[model samples]
Target: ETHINLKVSDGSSEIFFKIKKTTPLRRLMEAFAKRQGKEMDSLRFLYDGIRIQADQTPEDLDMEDNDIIEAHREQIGGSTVVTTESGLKYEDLTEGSGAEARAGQTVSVHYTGWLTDGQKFDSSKDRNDPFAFVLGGGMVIKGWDEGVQGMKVGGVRRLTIPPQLGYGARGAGGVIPPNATLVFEVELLDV
Candidate 1:
């Protein structure tokens, strides 16, 4: 059993649901089904709205102890860039560098993240050392999970991600605003 908040938006059905614990992903369909009173045999899920395809696994929904979720009928396309409160703009740093990284691949990086208002929310540069993480283990965000696997050692890249790929409207650490896109300057240091 788990308890989380969900915000659903498909133009017609825009509301919130306080999902009960142990609520199977299939059961979720019933909610949408009731809303439209229509059969959901072909309904798809877009976790955080990513148009994900699954046979349907409640566990795959994998809401943390108190995670917040959102649903959309279709992809919500937007520029993957952020203008922080401080008025600094970080966008389009990495255009297209996708890869498939295996476990044990070490990623070293000097990165900085900002809120939409130009405030420097987070960075590894202040430490004077590159941050490193192992690949393919849910050790990072979903964007990096899919983004980092595509680079070689010494690779430099940028990631301009939407809130769906980032902290979303909830913001991280009470600094970033809700639905704020993130910017990251990363490098693959080693395996």
Candidate 2:
């Protein structure tokens, strides 16, 4: 396995990672789980190190050899939530650059997401790697899948995703309460 070290950063935080070639993204998560003494089932993957979805495959999504994965522990809160600006319902916010990346485009991102109560929900840059996702690919949430359009590389933006576009009626875990307003500070790095 090829070992690579990544200095992942988001708009606010950063961390360094030691990755292995033979290691699936899931293997990275298992390490995190061990640190917190939590079951891998309760966690999800994002970018850098925030939870996006724990079970997504790198090959299926065309992940790079140097890609960063974020993991999120499920939210805890009410099931009914709404957005402050969009008046749309959502679970949380995931911010990234607005650069428009078409299908099959390889993209890199830095982001941090939080809930209405100022509780941090998730972050990628906080870890040692920025999140990587295939543009126009169905590898992310509906909001991210749709919100990242019309952006350019090296650009940054703050996003407010409604629950309807985020987790919706079914909140992920406990960190994010239901019907919560979400906010994000995004930085689009490259295509």
Candidate 3:
């Protein structure tokens, strides 16, 4: 059997596992819940920001040894979560009370971006200046175009951008690594 190492993390904590590549991840999911003292259904597991099916194997996902699986608490009922076909996941942190943003409109936003490892790569907050761009204008990354489309003025959203929608193999400015997934906390300042 070809064994591989996998790490399950919930932002603050992590657990490591060694399993055969062909083994179904259901076993790993169950073990992780038990180890964390959490119910299996209470947590959602994701690989590359896409929800993982319990029946899928590491080989099926084309996962490498030491790849990480992110675990998040399942939201029973609350904010609207959206996952796009491009694997961009976004959810509003706080609903806005103002006008909603739409394509062709200029939107000003404040954002802070981090790598999956929690390394801060960029932030509009640091500069104290909100960045403005036309929605769906192709002026930004594909993730930003998709993630910022439905926002309202004063709304805050958390976006999980996959590598394909981000900087991809050649990262940006030497600050972001290659194939890195990006996490952004974006606030719609004006639209």
Candidate 2's C-alpha runs over 4 A off are 1-100
List candidate 1 stretches off by more than 4 Å: 1-104
Cα RMSD (angstroms) for every candidate in the order listed: 16.6, 17.0, 9.6
The ten-residue window of minimal lDDT in model 2 covers 88-97
Best by TM-score: 3
Candidate 1 TM-score to native? 0.44
Worst 10 residues of 3 by lDDT: 72-81
What would the TM-scores of all predictions be? 0.44, 0.46, 0.60
Residue range 134-155, candidate 1, lDDT tens digits: 7777788666665566655555
Per-residue lDDT tens digits of candidate 3, residues 74-158?
Answer: 6548446688887899987666789998889999999988888767788888899999999999999999999998888877788
lDDT of each: 0.55, 0.57, 0.85
Ranking by lDDT: 3, 2, 1
State each candidate's clash count.
21, 44, 0
